From a paper:
To enable the discovery of a small molecule inhibitor of OmpR, we solved the crystal structure of OmpRABA DNA binding domain (DBD) spanning the C-terminal residues 148 to 254 at a resolution of 2.2 Å. The analysis of the crystal structure showed that OmpRABA DBD consists of a three-stranded antiparallel β-sheet (β1, V153-F156; β2, W159-D162; β3, R166-T169) followed by three α-helices (α1, T179-E190; α2, R198-R206; α3, R215-I228) and ending with a β-hairpin (β4, I238-V241; β5, V244-F248). The arrangement of the β-sheets and α-helices represents the winged helix-turn-helix (wHTH) fold characteristic of DNA-binding proteins of the OmpR superfamily. The sequence identity between OmpRABA DBD and OmpRECO DBD is 69% and all the amino acid residues of OmpRECO that are involved in the DNA binding were conserved in OmpRABA. These observations suggest a very similar DNA-binding mode for both proteins, which is in line with OmpRABA binding to OmpRECO cognate binding site. The most likely interaction site (hotspot 1) in all structures is around conserved residues T240VWG(V/L)244 in OmpRABA DBD. Residue D218 in chain A may serve as an anchor point. Hotspot 2 in OmpRABA-DBD chain D contains residues S222, R223 and R226 (S206, R207 and R210 in OmpRECO DBD). The “backside” of OmpRABA DBD chain C features a third potential ligand binding pocket flanked by residues K186 (potential anchor residue), L204 and T178/T179. We used our developed D-ELISA to evaluate the inhibitory effect of the virtual hits on OmpRABA DNA binding. We only observed a dose-dependent inhibition of OmpRABA DNA binding for the compound VSIS_039 (STL300125, Vitas-M Chemical Limited), which was identified to bind to the hotspot 2 druggable pocket of OmpR (Figure 6(a,b)).
Numbering used by the authors:
A (entry chain A): 152 to 257
B (entry chain C): 152 to 208, 214 to 257
Write the structure that this text describes.
Amino acid sequence: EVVSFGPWSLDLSTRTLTREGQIVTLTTGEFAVLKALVQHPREPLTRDKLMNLARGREWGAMERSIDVQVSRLRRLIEDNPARARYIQTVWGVGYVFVPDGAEHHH
Amino acid sequence: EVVSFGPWSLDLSTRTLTREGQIVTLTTGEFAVLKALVQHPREPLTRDKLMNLARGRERSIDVQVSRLRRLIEDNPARARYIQTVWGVGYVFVPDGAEHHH
C-alpha cells in the first residue's frame, strides 16, 4: 500500500517517505498525521479527527500539536510551504490532503 | 507529580509545560520524550530506551530532542538540561550541571 503525490512516495508497509532515491526522516507523529491525510484524500479532516486518527483520543487535549505537525510536513513536502498544495487549510475546520495538488476551483 | 528545571515546570498529570505563566505547545512525541527524560534524571538513556519509554510499539528521537533543546535550552548548541552522551544517546540534568560538575 504505497501512495504517490508529485515527487513523493509514502510506503505504509515500511513506514518510509521517499523522493529522488532518498528516504526522508519523519517523526512518528509527522508520519501518523501524514498517513491519516493520505488515507483521506479530498476529505476535510478537523484538527480533532486528525489527532484521533494519528494518535488516539487519549491525546485529544494536545490538539494544537497537529497545526505544528502539519506546518513541519509542509516545510518538507510543499514546493512552496506558504502556498501549500498537497496539504491545504480548510478555514475554521482543519486540513485536506489533495493528491494532485489541485486548487479549490480545480 | 510536577517537575521543575530552571524556569520550566512540567506537570505529568495535566501533561502541560509552563514557563513565566505561559503554557507551551509540545507534540505528543516531544511530551513523551521530555517525560521519559525528566523521569530518569542523571541516567544516560540510549536512543532505544528513550523510544521504548516514549512510544513503546529510532532516528525520530534525535529530531525530537533537537526540537526540545531549541525550546528549553538557554543555548541550544550548548544544551545543559538535555546533554548528549556520545555514541550512546542522551541524559536529563535537572540543575543544568556540566559533566565535571
